[PDB]
Amino acid sequence: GAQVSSQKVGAHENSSTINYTTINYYRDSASNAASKQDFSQDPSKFTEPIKDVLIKTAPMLN
Amino acid sequence: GAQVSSQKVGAHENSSTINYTTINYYRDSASNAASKQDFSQDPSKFTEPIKDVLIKTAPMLN
Amino acid sequence: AATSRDALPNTEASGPTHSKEIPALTAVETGATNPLVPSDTVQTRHVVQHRSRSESSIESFFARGACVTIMTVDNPASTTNKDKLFAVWKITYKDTVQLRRKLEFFTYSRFDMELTFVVTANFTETNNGHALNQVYQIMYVPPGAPVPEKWDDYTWQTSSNPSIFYTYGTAPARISVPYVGISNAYSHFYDGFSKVPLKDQSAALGDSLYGAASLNDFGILAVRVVNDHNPTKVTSKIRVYLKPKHIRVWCPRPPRAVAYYGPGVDYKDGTLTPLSTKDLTTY
Amino acid sequence: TNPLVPSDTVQTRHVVQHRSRSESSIESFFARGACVTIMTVDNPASTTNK
Amino acid sequence: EACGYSDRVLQLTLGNSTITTQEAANSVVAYGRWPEYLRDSEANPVDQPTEPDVAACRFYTLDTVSWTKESRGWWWKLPDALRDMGLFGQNMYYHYLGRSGYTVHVQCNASKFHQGALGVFAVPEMCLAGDSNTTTMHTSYQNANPGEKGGTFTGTFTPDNNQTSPARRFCPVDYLLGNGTLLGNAFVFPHQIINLRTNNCATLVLPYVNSLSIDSMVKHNNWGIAILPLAPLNFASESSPEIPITLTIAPMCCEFNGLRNITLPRLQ
Amino acid sequence: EACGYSDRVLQLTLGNSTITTQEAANSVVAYGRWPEYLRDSEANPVDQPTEPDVAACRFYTLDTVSWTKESRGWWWKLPDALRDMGLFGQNMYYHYLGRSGYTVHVQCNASKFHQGALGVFAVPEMCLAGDSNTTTMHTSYQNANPGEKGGTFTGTFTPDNNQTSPARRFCPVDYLLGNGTLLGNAFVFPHQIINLRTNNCATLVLPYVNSLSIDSMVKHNNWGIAILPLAPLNFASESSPEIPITLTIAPMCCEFNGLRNITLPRLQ
Amino acid sequence: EACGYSDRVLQLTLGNSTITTQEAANSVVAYGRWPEYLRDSEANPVDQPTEPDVAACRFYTLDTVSWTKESRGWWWKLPDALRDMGLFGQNMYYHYLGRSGYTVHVQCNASKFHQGALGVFAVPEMCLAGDS
Amino acid sequence: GSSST
Amino acid sequence: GSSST
Amino acid sequence: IDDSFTEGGYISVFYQTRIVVPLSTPREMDILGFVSACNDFSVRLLRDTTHIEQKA
């Protein structure tokens, strides 16, 4: 059941992906560490909540 | 995800490559130990920084 | 493809010479070092070389935890008129001389950093009371964050700052830090200023220190004893060890030959004569 | 909010971006143990009146 | 070459300027890196750069200094020595950011009966030591940046005792390379030697070196040129000889970012 | 366009400068020619040109003038009006030769209750008439070249009578376009009209025009900008109204030849 | 649109009520989510819901307030502002539970010679501070 | 066994 | 699984 | 934080021409300003804020 994932390697040694391994020891999900494998979304629902889609090169009001 | 690498064996027992195993436990590369699997380079940029490549048997100045 | 632990080149057998090839004669004015091996100037036998440069690799040269500072904290009686001492340290490799000299063989560097903390405590007075086991808080305060003014003020809450809670007597504390610079590499030397003196502006406003870039480069470590005031006073010291791991270095420099005088390249009068007397024709 | 980038209002060069928003993710922003309370307890002499 | 070409005879051309030399000792390219413009993969300011090409990347000749038996050494900082040089200087002062490489050509000729050897060193980040024993890191911007005029090395550390009105200047002792390290090891820096029996000049091609892709040229010097007499000047039997040293420098592949109004520095 | 685009609403971007206009009357490209760099087939100086691109080819805003009921008209000469403008001016004065095109954007807004119409004319070789009736062709370089400040038209020819110390300046009578020809025909020159009920601005794109591929920018102006009130300013019932006119000009495709030391002109 | 349609001119119709506007600045849909009925996968009370449709989902006009130079601002809470509005209010008070979305149309006209700008904010859970 | 990613 | 070297 | 080594520069606003009104119109008016980040904007090294605190 070992989970193997990639590290985003910043400072490299004068020394090819580097991985790390994870095993969950407990039955309850709450006990698990944070994966940090998170997703990003586009800000539109906050930045552009208007009904008619805006074209940035066109006049906002027409 | 286990990494297996060779040891350079110096003093041998009265006892074939010997290996060692490594597993990274953490998501951040910074947390990782030093591999010590390092590369060497040739000293030329410091020892011979001249524009015209030198031939050691020829006169340095011609 | 040449590994650091690879063996160095074999000596090749070389015989007598009567030739127009002149390896021994050169001209150092060019800026180059003459690439000679013994078989260029003397007759040599064949040697199968086994030696390696493994231990002089940049990692190997720096792969050791070096002491960069000693922080003092205490936990006094409630009744004393002096405040309980918590420690504030501006983080740097320049407060001690040994690792500083090794890093200063190079102009620039990138590395991840391992910090290890050794904590020791002792009694101060010929008193006979006791202290129960102390827990220590080591909080990193990055530039901008509220610096503590009292051992017990709100800042020690650390909702966002990284803190280590160390228990006395357990194995020494240890953390790793990524490459945190706002540059592509750490500058060991900065031939410049952080401000431009402008004609139009007053002298005082345009002034800054030579060689100093960001006034608060990396923040501070704040350390305290979390335990409440005890009738018997205990003083404790935190020794910080720094190890540069996963290191890369650029542009070599001559080593510091005279004693260090402050954070910059300055030298003090009286410390400038390092070399001993030895006569030109004396072995 | 007007979705403008610098190339809309000034002449720009080509930059290959490397920066990431990894540390401002909701997990990352909260992934730290914060002090929420300090509880006091004791263990007195048997003889005390409290 | 068989039909006459030689390592001693060079011609360099940049913009409308040409240098000839009949007595060179090859050329050095620092750290094996030729100057280059900033690549998109290493770029950082997003605005379109200013690249002056032939108007800035040409040979500027600085004021000629004089070598004598009393001469302890001379130093310059780049870009500072070129700050008032034509359109390179204008472009430097109109922009917040700038980067540049350089071809440095040091000139010193004498005669087959003179002797002497000059060490010509190019030091990345050449931080020098100040004149004080009571305060540190305190050399004023004005004293730290001499422009074309350069500065000199001294054979003796002599501390500024005026505590009420401090001189705030460097005190670069020559055998310590003005920075606390021994001169004999300065050869790990890119260099050439003008040994008067062998060559009339030194030529060093310098890349942009920094911990950043581009920086404030006004706040920060990237390279220092240090010229020291490794072997003192000598001629026939004259107790007081003199020969000139002329320094000529050309910017290479220089680009600038962050255009606004001109910087007018307090240089006095 | 169906999703809102219009001839009245323009955005212009050059270098780090952007102009927006919500009340334009299209744009004029003089003689149908967009500015271009000098072609090899029409080239003449053989040396590598200096081309400053974003550092010089950007929008420079000159001093704002004021339109009133007394205003007879204003004039400027190019490149002269831009001679002290940033790196365009530096590049101009460091080289013997230079050529440039321009985007001229004249700005004048008022309100739906004002009236007035400005004729904005771009004249190739705009030679103006001097103030003398005893001597001809005698306007001094200083008076002929006002820089950014510009000059003005007069409604009356008033001859310089001081024969011993002549004023040596122009006397540009407005209905004669300051040159002996009637203003009503000035419309054969590239132009736009800022009629206050219709538009807040005029925009003219000017090619390099000359009888030569490249010339001395210091000795010779290629274009003259003439702004005259075709219909006088009027507002509500105010006997003395005023509205500003701001002139913004950008060099385009400018290249320079013959680099040497900077020209320091006698401008006073 | 080519044959006249515009972002400034809107017509909204709900039930027996219609709103026209000739000077709008588009419309906002909060968090990009249009109102919807409760899905079976997110449902919780098991009893058959009451859904009043056109009798409650129509435009109610509240008392007109007045803007002056002394005006510091105004606030309302939903569903509270609509509690006495026709059959929406009756349905609200006869049931223990209820959920609703809203179309809010704030109206303020003046003339080409007036000035002023009103910030119209919709705050989820707008808890306000008390006087003590 | 090993779930890779 | 095992990444060998 | 305010630091000369990483200083960002200067924003300023000016009148290019002037505000022009007719008669019966207010001669003074307000402008409002807004700031936001572009899609190439990022932040790093999480820390505690000085904009909230708890004395006692």
Ligand SMILES: CCOC(=O)c1ccc(OCCC2CCN(c3ccc(C)nn3)CC2)cc1
């Ligand atoms: C310019 C001279 O100094 C340096 O270049 C130099 C000096 C110190 C260096 O360390 C980087 C700064 C910090 C980074 C973060 N840090 C931390 C972080 C978290 C904790 C709990 N404790 N310490 C401790 C050190 C790295 C480089």
Ligand SMILES: *C(=O)CCCCCCCCCCCCC
């Ligand atoms: C999937 O996990 C199969 C491989 C397991 C390898 C051994 C894991 C290490 C020991 C974990 C023991 C169980 C912890 C509750």
Ligand SMILES: *C(=O)CCCCCCCCCCCCC
């Ligand atoms: C690759 O790693 C697959 C095999 C893993 C074997 C078990 C590793 C030992 C337990 C590590 C647990 C995870 C540590 C965070």
